[PDB]
Amino acid sequence: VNSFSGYLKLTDNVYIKNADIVEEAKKVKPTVVVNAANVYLKHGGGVAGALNKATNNAMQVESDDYIATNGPLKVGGSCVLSGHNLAKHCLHVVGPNVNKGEDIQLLKSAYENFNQHEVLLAPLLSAGIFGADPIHSLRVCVDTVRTNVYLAVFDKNLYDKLVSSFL
Ligand SMILES: CC[C@@H](CNc1ncnc2nc[nH]c12)NC(=O)CC1CCCCC1
Structure with a gap:
């Protein structure tokens, strides 16, 4: 038993809710919140800008040090950093950005990062400002992630639309 409330059950391991991930994080304080990151960890809008704003820019400061030491992430890759005031850890995951021409097949690789964590609070990767079909992102999530994922849309x-079309 965990503390996530009012999620609809999609599969054995995937749950969904209409919620702002920032507000879910602040209320739950999950072990892992997933950020919809870019390779430079420049957290400007969408999930990333919203989480970073909620950390008073501490997420960006930490991220800039990470990049200065390690260089950019790969599309499809991830890193674990602090969750600051929102979670124990933040898993920064880079899904492909269709509005930049990146291979959608990399979305499966992006979701595979979730399997390294038993329970996650997460957004829909590559969707929204990243430009991919959201029904497809949910399908890839369900067909790739085996650990317990709580999706906040x-x-x-x-x-x-996502629930009503899940089938
Ligand atoms: C589906 C991904 C999600 C990502 N963004 C966020 N997901 C969770 N919590 C957040 N808090 C702040 N941004 C958050 N984007 C949206 O839902 C917006 C809709 C995208 C399609 C077109 C209509 C708007």
Whole structure:
């Protein structure tokens, strides 16, 4: 038993809710919150800008030191950093950004990072400002992630469409 509330059950291991990931994080304080990152860990908008704003920019400061030491992430890759005031850890995961021309096949690789963590609070990768089909992202999630994932979808209208089309 965990502390996530009002999630609809999609599969054995995938749950979904119409919620702002920042508000879910602040209420739950999960072990892992997933950030929808880019390779430079420049957290400007969408999930990344919203989480970073909620950390008072501490996420960005930590991320800049990470990049200065390690260089950019790979598309499809990830790193574990602090969750600051939102979670124990933040798993920064880079899904492909279709609005930049990146291979959508890399979305499966991105979701594979979730399997290194038993339970995660996460957004829909590559969707929203990253430009990919959200129904496809949810499908890849369900077909790739084997650990327990609690998906927070910000847009109400999209959430209704995702559930109603899941089948
Ligand atoms: C589906 C991914 C999600 C990612 N963004 C966020 N996901 C969770 N919590 C967040 N808090 C702040 N941003 C958050 N984007 C949205 O839902 C917005 C809709 C995308 C399609 C077109 C209509 C808008």
